[PDB]
């Protein structure tokens, strides 16, 4: 179990790189979508107010 643990530390630190991706990628995606929609509304509001 000391041998099935020196490798299991390696399986764990690779899951930490992978879980970084699933989380930073998900939050990056839902936030850049809201920033783009609000830019369209913002450039239109300048014209609409003109």
């Amino acid at each position: 179990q000391s041998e099935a643990e020196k490798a299991r530390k390696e399986l764990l630190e690779l899951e930490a790189l992978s879980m970084a991706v699933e989380s930073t990628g998900t939050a990056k995606a839902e936030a850049e979508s809201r920033a783009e929609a609000a830019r369209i509304e913002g450039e239109g509001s300048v014209l609409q107010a003109k």
Partner: protein
């Protein structure tokens, strides 16, 4: 001289035999259990390396 003494000595050897048959059957079982663990040690480590 007496026969019933020779019987009492006859059951003495029937035991002596069973004492050596029990010792190989216990020495085999301890080797079976040792190898069965040398595989499990690798089969469990191999799943983690996959």
């Amino acid at each position: 001289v007496d026969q019933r003494t020779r019987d009492a000595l006859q059951r003495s050897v029937q035991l002596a035999i069973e004492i050596t048959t029990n010792s190989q059957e216990a020495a085999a079982k301890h080797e079976a259990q040792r190898l069965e663990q040398e595989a499990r040690g690798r089969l469990e480590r191999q799943k983690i390396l996959d």
